[PDB]
Ligand binder design. Structure first.
Ligand SMILES: CCS(=O)(=O)Nc1ccc(F)c(C(=O)c2c[nH]c3ncc(-c4cccnc4)cc23)c1F
Lengths: 251, 257
């Protein structure tokens, strides 16, 4: 039916962060929620529908590894309401906490991410921006993928960089970088700190992630799987169901 | 929009529960999932309303403390696809595991349960079958409320309020059952131990001379929880609070101590 939450039902709290679209706050609504208020004030009737369309896309996601959509608001500002995640992003663990994860967890996280990613493809949903920042680990066990309802070029496929370039293949490339981060412990092109350089080089096929940076612990069974994900040639990339099967066999 | 999952996608596995309500197997569908299916030649549409009601009530929930409904089925067996849960029920932990908790966790479990129950009532949903058995502990410490079935919008006798025991079901009945669940958390024990007759409980609780022994609460248990619990267990419907007030008092406690 309708998942709108009437004005005054949510007690908006502390400002968590800002994104290109939206500002995230912690909220009070039958427990803890997260509210993403759109960068918008007025009830513009035509962008209203445009907003509602994105809600329609969100409300078709009922998977454990996808961040739980819970409702939307219209009156105290346009807003997306989801579950609250305890802990930090996958980016924070890998790069900002220096926290040592056992190799067993890494594969699980990838497996969880692939579970979420396959589901979106099954529902014919292209994420368009899958990175470790949009992967929230609830209580450091459970993957929640969000932010799918002049940017992050590290997870960007070659065909996306040079301009329909957004497809299920580009999400596959994004996952390879995610795997890279997990299996190398860091972001790609770390030595080359030049955005424009990377854009031009990865775009022309001159640059690709370095796999000598993977640790010895990494199974070469899916070290090969990255290569499949990280292919410059998009049609030579594995689909996510294909991907989901291979990763799972690792335990 | 459609939540129908046509078959072939679903890879059924090992069953965990059975009966005449639908067997529940552990399937794999884009990961670990759960399926509750009728093993029948044909559910000649007497079952077809029960199934349709549950799909209607499930499709309208999206909460972390409510079991995650993932889909339904019509073509072969009737089935309900929900998230897979890792762990055992609250009933298992308190009673069937002989495990024990700190006050800290016990009050937390009540809160998460209160959140889901508050959510259900806000969506104008009556659970009608709330008990420790239907409260799953997923990831070993996060509440999942399920087994809707009797939901709408024998063996379950202990969580039954007099007006149901003596349409009886209401938000108030859910409230009474909540008080019983609180009792299991704050005592570790099921109500009416000194009564091993089904006929004793059913008459006495219905009559209004039987009530849980609140002397059995833990020493570490808050005086506010024991007070809150007695309010949910009121013999008279009207004197029972609503979950917004129930959740409010709990939240302070969890923060207070
Ligand atoms: C599926 C809906 S979406 O539109 O595609 N995504 C989405 C919508 C609304 C949101 F608020 C959030 C969000 O940032 C968070 C949603 N729950 C969260 N829980 C924790 C955090 C967080 C992240 C980093 C540091 N501290 C807290 C961030 C979020 C969100 F990701």
């Amino acid at each position: 039916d309708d998942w709108e939450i009437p004005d005054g039902q949510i007690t908006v709290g502390q400002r968590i962060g800002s994104g290109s679209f939206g500002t995230v706050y912690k909220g009070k609504w039958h427990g803890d929620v997260a509210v993403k208020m759109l960068n918008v004030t007025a009830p513009t009737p035509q962008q209203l529908q445009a907003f509602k369309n994105e809600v329609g896309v969100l409300r078709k996601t009922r998977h454990v590894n996808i961040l739980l959509f819970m409702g939307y608001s219209t009156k105290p500002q346009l807003a997306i309401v989801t579950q609250w995640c305890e802990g930090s992003s996958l980016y924070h663990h890998l790069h900002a906490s220096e926290t040592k994860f056992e190799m067993k967890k890494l594969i699980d996280i990838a497996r969880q991410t692939a579970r979420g990613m396959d589901y979106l493809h099954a529902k014919s949903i292209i994420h368009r921006d899958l990175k470790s920042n949009n992967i929230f680990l609830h209580e450091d066990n459970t993957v929640k993928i969000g932010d799918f309802g002049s940017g992050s070029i590290l997870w960007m496929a070659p065909e996306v960089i040079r301009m329909n370039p957004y497809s299920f293949q580009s999400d596959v490339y994004a996952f390879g970088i995610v795997l890279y981060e997990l299996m190398t412990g860091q972001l790609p092109y770390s030595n080359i700190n030049n955005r424009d350089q990377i854009i031009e080089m990865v775009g022309r096929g001159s640059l690709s992630p370095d796999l000598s940076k993977v640790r010895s612990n990494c199974p070469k069974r899916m070290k090969r799987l990255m290569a499949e994900c990280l292919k410059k040639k998009r049609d030579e990339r594995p689909s996510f169901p294909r991907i989901l099967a291979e990763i799972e066999e690792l335990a």
